[PDB]
Design an enzyme around this catalytic site. Structure first.
Site, PDB file in Angstrom:
ATOM      1  N   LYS A 108       1.539  -6.908  43.172  1.00 20.10           N
ATOM      2  CA  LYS A 108       0.916  -7.898  42.301  1.00 20.10           C
ATOM      3  C   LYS A 108      -0.127  -8.719  43.052  1.00 20.10           C
ATOM      4  CE  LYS A 108       3.027  -7.162  38.391  1.00 20.10           C
ATOM      5  NZ  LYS A 108       4.109  -6.211  38.778  1.00 20.10           N
ATOM      6  N   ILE A 158       9.180  -9.894  37.478  1.00 18.44           N
ATOM      7  CA  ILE A 158       9.262  -9.125  36.250  1.00 18.44           C
ATOM      8  C   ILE A 158       9.036  -7.664  36.614  1.00 18.44           C
ATOM      9  CG2 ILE A 158       8.309  -8.758  33.956  1.00 18.44           C
ATOM     10  CD1 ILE A 158       7.227 -11.707  34.183  1.00 18.44           C
ATOM     11  N   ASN A 163      19.029 -13.028  47.061  1.00 17.92           N
ATOM     12  CA  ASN A 163      19.373 -12.598  45.710  1.00 17.92           C
ATOM     13  C   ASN A 163      18.118 -12.136  44.988  1.00 17.92           C
ATOM     14  OD1 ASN A 163      22.175 -13.179  45.787  1.00 17.92           O
ATOM     15  ND2 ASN A 163      21.792 -15.338  45.301  1.00 17.92           N
ATOM     16  N   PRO A 166       5.507 -13.087  40.787  1.00 17.84           N
ATOM     17  CA  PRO A 166       6.785 -13.160  41.525  1.00 17.84           C
ATOM     18  C   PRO A 166       6.998 -14.505  42.214  1.00 17.84           C
ATOM     19  CG  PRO A 166       5.816 -11.036  41.914  1.00 17.84           C
ATOM     20  CD  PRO A 166       4.768 -11.864  41.151  1.00 17.84           C
TER      21      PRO A 166
HETATM   22  C1  LIG Z   1      -0.023 -16.449  37.202  1.00 15.18           C
HETATM   23  C2  LIG Z   1      -0.435 -15.402  36.165  1.00 15.18           C
HETATM   24  C3  LIG Z   1      -1.838 -14.866  36.460  1.00 15.18           C
HETATM   25  C4  LIG Z   1       0.561 -14.241  36.097  1.00 15.18           C
HETATM   26  C5  LIG Z   1       1.637 -14.095  36.870  1.00 15.18           C
HETATM   27  N1  LIG Z   1       2.238 -12.963  36.514  1.00 15.18           N
HETATM   28  N2  LIG Z   1       3.253 -12.406  36.938  1.00 15.18           N
HETATM   29  C6  LIG Z   1       3.707 -11.241  36.449  1.00 15.18           C
HETATM   30  O1  LIG Z   1       4.829 -10.675  36.970  1.00 15.18           O
HETATM   31  C7  LIG Z   1       3.027 -10.608  35.415  1.00 15.18           C
HETATM   32  C8  LIG Z   1       1.877 -11.207  34.910  1.00 15.18           C
HETATM   33  C9  LIG Z   1       1.476 -12.411  35.476  1.00 15.18           C
HETATM   34  N3  LIG Z   1       0.450 -13.226  35.246  1.00 15.18           N
END
Ligand SMILES: CC(C)c1cn2nc(O)ccc2n1
Lengths: 118, 114, 117
Positions: B32, B64, B97, B1
């Site tokens: 995350k 995502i 946003n 993010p």
């Molecule tokens: C920087 C790397 C480890 C990374 C960042 N993201 N972000 C996500 O939303 C999904 C998988 C992912 N891997």
């Protein structure tokens, strides 16, 4: 198309000709004429990636079309390559957000690129 | 993010630890790992909100997934709280946003997340 | 609504009253009260348009609704006109990205504009 790079790398580390190189490489990559490519680099930014302040970049590429799965993978290899070579930013500290713009949602020259309907 | 804050608050008013606090709290809120979190703070901006140049902020959060009705309200409470406490910006002078990014539309490490 | 202008025009060339003119003209254009309107101007940027470093602007307008074919063409005429008059930027060196935001995807005042469910 429009490519924006925000980075914590210092301004002095941005090579002369970098905007021109981005313009030419993006015209080649997107198939769009160079006259319609806009580039914007913003150095000296206060940012972190994974909690770390080592060199990183947050980027966006907007285009009307020519955005999609395989194409974006190609753009990412190209743009990460340029950022690594020219600004010395590791590819695993770069995010690029891709945007497929509708012609009606892009203004230019007192109007938009939707010139077909009313 | 990815979280971006643009504000007319002066740079000197951004407290030590602010980027780290944003990183840790966004990691917690989005579910995350902190490794996934990018933050960007842009002070001293020329902006107005409602025609006034009192402290304000324009923000974006790209993720995502993990974007939606109740989740976004939760992010807004979290982020407005931090901006009010740390930068002394009133919550009613902040816009955020939210973008739910398709994995195919996010590049990282020479490829995308698709 | 939220309007952002990034430009290579220097800060000194931004006229007194510019933010207020944008605020008021955008309230008028979108039919939204001025209290809702946020504006953000970023001068002195390192940018190029078409491989040229002559004055240019990269802009965005975000609004919940009031975004669409004819409306966006009207916004473009208004905004390019202001950039030309005030910052002396040629309209054909301006891009404006328009975003129709969903109410659920805009935060404000500790919540969002999706208050129904
Ligand atoms: C920087 C790397 C480890 C990374 C960042 N993201 N972000 C996500 O939303 C999904 C998988 C992912 N891997």
């Amino acid at each position: 198309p429009m490519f924006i790079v925000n980075t914590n790398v210092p301004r002095a580390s941005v090579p002369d000709g970098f905007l021109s190189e981005l313009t030419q490489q993006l015209a080649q990559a997107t198939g769009k004429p160079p006259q319609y490519i806009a580039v914007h680099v913003v150095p000296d930014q206060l940012m972190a990636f994974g909690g770390s302040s080592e060199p990183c970049a947050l980027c966006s590429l907007h285009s009307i079309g020519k955005i999609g799965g395989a194409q974006n993978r190609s753009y990412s290899k190209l743009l990460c390559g340029l950022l690594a070579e020219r600004l010395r930013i590791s590819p695993d500290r770069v995010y690029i957000n891709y945007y497929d713009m509708n012609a009606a949602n892009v203004g230019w020259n007192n109007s938009t690129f939707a010139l077909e309907h009313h």
